[PDB]
Amino acid sequence: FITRSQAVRKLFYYAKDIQYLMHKFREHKTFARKLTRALGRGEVSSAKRLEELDHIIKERYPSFPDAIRDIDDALNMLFLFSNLQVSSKIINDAQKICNQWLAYVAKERLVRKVFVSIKGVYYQAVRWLVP
RNA sequence: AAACUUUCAACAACGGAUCUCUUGGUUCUCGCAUCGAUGAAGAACGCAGCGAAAUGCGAUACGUAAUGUGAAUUGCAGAAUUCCGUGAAUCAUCGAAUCUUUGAACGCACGCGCCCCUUGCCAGGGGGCAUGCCUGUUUGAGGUCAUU
Predict the structure, then answer these.
(1) Range 102-131, chain A: CB under 7 Å to any strand B atom
(2) Proximity of residue A24 CB to strand B below 7 A
(3) Residue A13 — φ and ψ, nearest 5°?
(4) What's the rounded Cα separation, in Å, for the pair A76 and A127?
(5) What distance in Å separates the CA atoms of residue A126 and residue A38, rounded to the nearest whole number?
(6) What are phi and psi of A45, to 5 degrees?
(7) A123: part of which helix (H) or strand (E)?
């Protein structure tokens, strides 16, 4: 069997289900060198012109109910960031997402269990936590 | 004498010489430019029911695809055909396919490796990986200049 390091370099796992999986993140690296070239040129207009995961979601979760498997960690991370070198815009977006989720939950009032704890106020709809 | 040597008329054998002819050769004149990595010429193996040569064909193998003709092919068997019909010919045209192994011959050589993928540790199935050079994209390394 191909080792994890060897498989990653080529791209313990089954080779049958990994070889076919070899098929914009790599292309984005060119933007760094283009920006460096623009900086070297000393003009910012070209830099401004240069400046101007749905696919993975479906395969991981082919159906909406399947999202519940990872929704625990998803909500945990989102709520942790909502209260936390992360940019302020990322924090604001995470807080807005959590606020919208809470508003929708309150609209339907789909809550069954709660538990105030030292770690945080636990909740159940699916279980989720907020600090 | 018979037998046997020799000249000649007739009869009986060789060979195709003479005569007649040819889907032939040679020579003259006229129109055109038409080989090849999108794989040339050439060589080997197979293909028709029966097959020596020639021609055609490449496991779709004396052919497959398409149009015209309209009732065949023929040495033998065999097929039919609704033949008033989108339909037979070993017919003609031929623009669409297949195109075995070699061969400029092209994975590495003087047997024999790799990407791919697939339908079921492992495999069938399908295309490629030769060298010289031109344009473009990607990565890596090294000389100049800048670095308050």
Answers:
(1) none
(2) no
(3) -135, 155
(4) 10
(5) 50
(6) -60, -45
(7) strand A121-124
**Measured in angstroms, what separates residue A38's CA from nucleotide B2's C1'?**
141
User: A29: Cβ under 7 Å from strand B?
Assistant: yes
**Cβ of residue A1 near strand B, that is under 7 Å?**
yes
DSSP bridge pairs for A114: A123
Task: Evaluate if the CB of A20 falls below 7 Å from strand B.
Answer: yes
- C1’ B40 / CA A32, Å: 51
Other C-beta atoms lying within 10 Å of the C-beta of residue A19: 13
3-state percent helix, strand, coil for chain A, nearest multiple of 5: 65, 10, 25
Give distance CA A30 / C1' B133 (Å): 29
Distance A10 CA to B122 C1' (A): 22
Q: Please give the structure tokens belonging to residue A19.
A: 């070889």
For A82, other C-beta atoms within 10 Å of its C-beta total: 19
Q: Which stretches of A16-112 are assigned E, i.e. beta strand? A: none
> How many angstroms is the resolution?
3.3
* Backbone angle region of A109, left / alpha / beta, with phi > 0 → left and psi within -120 to 50 → alpha: left
